[PDB]
């Protein structure tokens, strides 16, 4: 060999793959309109009328294929594809189109064929010819294909259910985006949620990986607030090159352009025929609307109890992918994710894919109990709510001084707790500095003990006395708000806390650790609708309603219920300046005014949130 | 806004930039032959009249100035680059021929113009054109040009010293590579380093980034031990592939390829002309053998003591452009990194580059002692050797039952010490598993304790009792080893070991630490010529001469010196069969025996360790 | 008050306890023979014939009642009292006869009335006394009395089922101390173990509270190699004023000393009165014969399978009384330890101790499986042995090569394996440096990963191919090893490991992790009898005998089975200086020798562990 001989020689360097127990293939799958999808397959070697599991992604097939450079698959493929691998499965999957190696144009969450897609393909039809292609081209398989995934791989899977091919035999959409607008990732409630800007640049810059927004510093606090608005900041980062950015300023309130892609009215209008199995986190901090509201959308038409399944786990966003044996201070019982991929999403998916495999006792809700610290099997959800369930919520009202109890309010007290929220100084939704980067703060931001937030004077603390015997909660709290503000609009931020006995000496950290079991904001410009935004009234006491993440909690005795009201959750959510503007991406620095916030008590007007006791 | 309007847009995206303190420059710059090497200038906003530092790097210039996307240049750049932020100084970093975006064939440390290079261009040539470019073409500049880089980084400086243009003012080698035969990265006295393996793919793979080698598991002590030879992981790894992989190979011995290759022997040779400062880190364990050896081959001509000078700091390879505050469990005085970068560096650099600047009061040597945790300013290094230094080594022999001392060996006494080498059963160089990846690992291996081997059979161990008064050494420790081998092959390590006093009150886990100041291996059929091996006559004790690394430490009172012999340093070397084979790499299963060792401890055969005392 | 009033009053400061939710009471209960016993008794306020909770202790009653200084009797007490405390139970720490606030001699686990105690009492009629002091004047309490502790605290419990009052309806002996020579904490199997040097400091230097033994250095395996024998290091540290000490090296041997305070034997002629549960950790580091030894001695009494039960839990000594999440690098499905006291130990308690409690579902045998993770109720244990078992032991041969199969050794091998065992430089029960006082290091040896030794060529190593199908043992492997010395003593360890898959994705630490699953060291000199020891004939094959540690463990697919043999496991066990000695205890410095050792592998002599498989 000469020494000026290249050592880069310009041929592809192959890997070895001699001691590879597994084969990987990759194709270029046409679609109906000759665009082709970058597809990757790998196949256990030796299988033999082996099932597929698909997943469609907007996150690199690739790179999902390879969560370790090995030849074991159970190392190559991603911890949550454990229960497929150990099953024999085909795994499967593919870019979306317009992303990575993928042909075609990306539409952020491309829209059903409708009045928003004027188009002959979407991700149904795509996910349709994806699966033709497969039982018809992968020999090695029984032509029986199961579809999962997490997020936007969620999604992708309920798109396939509005109209699925008949090779489509189980369905598991976990933590979907259904309503982005409504509780998912763009809004909650209509606040805006400025965590996603990085995902903006990181998923719309280029066909494959982007990047993030570069920061003037370390703490989003300060870059955010010193930045003024979101348009502002979007603007100084360059967004206005995003068409997304653009569809996002342009329709601010709840109109046709969301209502036509909330995909829990679609699922409602949709024929119950794929056992489908509905899936989130307890703490799903970036779509915890979707999962519960696509199961009670079909619920109701599942007859016998086998096609509508629903599975809410003690999990952060997407944790049931990985190790559920904790979530920042919590600690639960075992591997809760593990757990459920074991247990009961294997036997349910084998039951659907696996030639001879016997029927699964799936339990029709599968529900961790996050204050008693075990799984619930149970055949329906909620077990309590206002009306038509098992159990009948009770008013948990808000009291002067302070206090918290199931009794009304009584006269000869003040009839309201008063607050200054100051737009210049918000609320912090997590100690300062805020990195949005930062993995462990974001995906543990839900249980994060809020005392770092509990005496400030800008947070309402509402708290009741010690329990002497459990009280077990077990469906979607709702807030009956009676509130108002010296100015003409603003946030309303309310949260559900167990509090931990005062002394925890097994485990100090935990002593008098403030919870949140659920919480919640709500931009109150849409307190009367959603779709038609409009000013509060000065100092006027109005009614806000809206409904708290669900909560499958005992609080145990030695604890104590509380509620934190405030009006900013910063800089997850932009600044409600507190003066109403036609659109509040594009506030102006006058806009941002102080307001005298009244969270009233009385007996004509009590705040309180029905509590789905039982 | 249509909402099919596609979110990648057609026009790619551009992120913002105005807030940014500097301006971002690339250019295509070519060399004599026509090929264009991608060349990144990072420019302070208003810079005029100001010096340039160039660094030539095969990882990645655009990568090398994006520390972290911010619009800081302190920021943006390295934290080695912060003198140069703070100094005004224009940053640039070039693609070398043949990587990322630089055109042109890519050969592993190109060689210059000669025996082994018959084309007209070498890294002297590109960094010549290169620099005559940037003085022409950058007008912010006052046309004086400075080098710096560690490692591959570092011997583009040293290439560009062959033949400098008359712009290079000043040049620093940081842990250059001189010598990658006899001490540096690829073998260390002809024993092969397999830790560069993962270096092969990631460099030579593509024309940008690589990736390693699949590993079958996580310990590398078991992927090297099951896979054989040397030869046989990188066959079953795809390595074949690699024209560099052949030529290390076919080039087992110190033969005209290696010779050729030798940079400490052409600036022996080389005039000196441009201020140069040597630097490397006493704890250097990737190139140990560079900068101090080429510092030596011309400091005889340094006749005002002003072009030629040498740093050696309490640092791993490339340390001392991160943080010098510690090194695994050893704790310095300060920021020993930042010092040298803020203290030395820069006056050295402002001297000869910016105009009108003062002089700087640098000192020949630079040198860290790490016995006594301080920074010694000298005229001259090594301050003790055999012969023509202000202080004489002393010879410090092993003795028999495992002791230590300056005094020669006394009759009555076993006339040396046995153990047995075992290839199945290789004694390992640091703590099981062994995981390359680790970068904490392997930064800090050198320093690691070394009773996770002592008390092993097939290590022998030689000790003094504890020291009464501070033994300082100041040189490169020499070894003379009597020993003798059943076998016809074997390797030689030598351990030069400070051992901490036996408790450490104030640092608990330091009590009895055996930190290795020095240590060496020797591929022992090298014995009489590095280019002509020889099979070691069985049964026969001889003798083998080889240097230690250089050490600045004094041995404090409390503490003992301590010296470990062993045949193994496994996976980080491969393992010496013990068997005369023509080619170590590619040793076939049988290949391998059991050997039985003896170190010669009597006064007729006596083996010990030149030091460098004063 | 005036400036020079003393600050310190002299009389004594009574703490605030108006806010406590219990009662502490101190008092001096009078034995048979007047000598009067310190008992702390805590209450819970508002208590009414409620039982109470008895446990008797050598660790300072005040203390075990302290673990936090609160006015909740949940965090006053330990964690393992947490279940007592919510069951509303009155709970009772007495010190026992010489200890702390007691009056009374103190004998080191005092032995019953018999040959070894002339007296009138002992713990047997130490807590008659005491539990007929406390239903006769505690009114606070409805007369039952249950006994529970772990260690010596549960070898008190043991002591009174000898002969127990009528009061005591239940007992839970957690990890006793039963046979102090056979296997639980003075020495194993005849080896001594130097762990408890500092126990006998800490225990026997005053009434109190004493102290661990001052140490030259930090390394263990240094301080106890440079002393020379367990019996010069204890000379030097001052233990020769210490009965205690004498006892030890005056009954080396199982000779009548030792047979008469073997509990187990006691058991095995005591009726079957109290329902008593045993209980022990796997992995219990220093009690692992006592509670299955005494429970066997009991159960075919036990005719309804009503009186006698057993648990044995993933955890090291005493870990049932805080939290079994963890073990080392183990992770176990959920708080196993807060799972037994909360589903099986509380209610078991109540159905015996608290008025008209319902029937508890206590299974016979609850048992953890360490390879499945999770827990087992049986009706009987062992599941396998080599008669009289649901299931039948199959020999795991050791092979030549480093192999082990379930096959019988085919002829043409190597009839053994050869290994030098060197006491000078001994092989280390873990990690150097060793601290004995560091309770994370001793905790959590037994589940260390044993790579740090293997490789090691005093340290034979046996392994699997890996698993293709779980392998499930349910019993006590039992060793049968054929093996030679060059010398006329020798010790002889042998490890049952669960080798992980090579690479474990998901928690990459794991990945190759050599888990003991059991282990055992047995020392050669007592082969043909313990009371009488022999010298081994030098270099003839000899059988040897011996029961490693319980399992119930499967070995999943892709793991490995494995064995280490080694002959020594230092500093927890003296050295074996392999040459006969009278009392190895005394052994002098030319005593200690080098030996060969091998290990038979052959079809006429082949070494094997009856596996205890199902
Ligand atoms: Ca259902
Ligand atoms: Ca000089
Ligand atoms: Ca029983």
Redesign the interface.
């Known amino acids: ?1 000469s ?7 310009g ?1 592809p ?4 793959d ?2 590879n127990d597994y084969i990987k293939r990759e194709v270029m799958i046409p679609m109906r309109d000759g665009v082709k999808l970058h597809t990757v397959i790998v196949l256990p070697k030796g299988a033999k009328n082996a099932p597929i599991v698909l997943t469609r992604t907007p996150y690199d097939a690739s790179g999902r294929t390879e ?6 698959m ?2 190559l493929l991603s ?1 949550g594809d ?1 229960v497929f691998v150990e099953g024999g499965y085909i795994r499967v999957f593919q870019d979306v189109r ?1 992303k990575y190696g993928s042909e075609g ?4 969450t491309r ?1 059903l064929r409708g009045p ?4 002959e393909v979407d991700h149904a039809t795509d996910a349709w010819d994806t699966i033709d292609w497969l039982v018809k081209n992968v020999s090695e398989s029984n032509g029986k294909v199961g579809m999962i995934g997490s997020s936007y791989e969620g999604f992708t899977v309920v798109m396939a259910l509005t109209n699925p091919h008949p090779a489509l035999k189980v369905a598991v959409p976990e933590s979907p985006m259904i309503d982005g607008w409504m509780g998912d990732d763009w809004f909650n409630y209509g606040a805006f949620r400025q965590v996603n800007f990085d995902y903006f ?1 990181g998923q ?4 494959g990986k ?7 510093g370390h703490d989003d606090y300060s870059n955010f607030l010193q930045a003024g608005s979101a348009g502002d900041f979007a603007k ?3 967004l206005e ?4 950015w ?2 996002l300023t ?1 329709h601010a309130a709840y109109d046709a ?1 969301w209502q036509e892609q909330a995909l829990d009215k679609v699922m409602a209008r949709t024929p119950l025929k794929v056992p489908t199995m509905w899936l989130q986190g307890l703490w799903d901090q970036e779509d915890m609307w979707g999962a519960i509201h696509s199961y009670a959308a079909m619920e109701p038409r599942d007859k016998r109890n086998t096609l509508n399944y629903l599975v809410m786990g003690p999990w952060r966003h997407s944790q049931v992918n990985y ?1 559920g ?1 904790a979530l920042g201070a919590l ?5 809760t994710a593990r757990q459920f991929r074991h247990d009961v999403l294997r036997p349910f998916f084998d039951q659907y894919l696996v030639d001879g495999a016997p029927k699964a006792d799936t339990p029709p809700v599968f529900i961790y109990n996050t204050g008693e ?1 075990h799984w619930d099997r149970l055949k329906a959800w909620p077990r309590s709510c206002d009306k038509g369930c098992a159990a009948t919520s009770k008013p948990l009202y808000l009291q002067a001084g302070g206090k918290l109890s199931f009794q009304p309010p009584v006269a000869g007290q003040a009839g309201f707790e008063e607050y200054v929220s100051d737009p210049a100084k918000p609320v912090p939704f997590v100690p300062r500095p805020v990195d949005f980067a930062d993995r462990a703060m974001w995906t543990t931001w839900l249980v994060h003990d809020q005392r770092f937030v509990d005496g400030r004077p800008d947070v309402l603390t509402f708290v009741t006395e010690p329990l002497t015997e459990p009280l077990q909660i077990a469906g979607a709290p709702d807030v009956h708000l009676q509130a108002s503000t010296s100015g003409s609009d603003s946030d309303w931020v309310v949260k559900l806390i167990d509090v931990y ?1 005062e ?4 485990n100090p950290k935990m002593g008098g650790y403030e919870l949140p079991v659920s919480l919640a904001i709500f931009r109150g410009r849409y307190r009367e609708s959603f779709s038609t935004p409009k000013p509060l009234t000065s100092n006027q006491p109005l009614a806000f309603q809206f409904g708290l993440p669900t909560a499958n909690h005992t609080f145990q005795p ?1 604890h104590r219920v509380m509620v934190q009201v405030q009006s900013s959750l910063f800089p997850l959510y932009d600044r409600n300046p507190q003066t109403y503007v036609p659109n509040i991406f594009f506030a102006k620095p006058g806009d941002y005014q102080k307001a005298t916030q009244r969270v009233y008590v009385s007996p004509e007007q009590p705040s309180y949130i029905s509590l789905p006791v039982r």
Do not use: C
């Open positions: 060999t020494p000026m001989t290249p050592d880069i020689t041929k360097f192959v890997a070895a001699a001691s969560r370790l450079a090995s030849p074991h159970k190392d911890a454990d317009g144009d990306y539409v952020m829209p928003l897609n004027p188009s640049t719309l810059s280029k066909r982007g990047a993030g927004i570069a920061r003037q100084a980062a360059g090159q995003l068409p997304w653009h569809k342009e352009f190790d044996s600690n639960f019982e075992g591997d610290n006995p002394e925890m000496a097994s030695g």
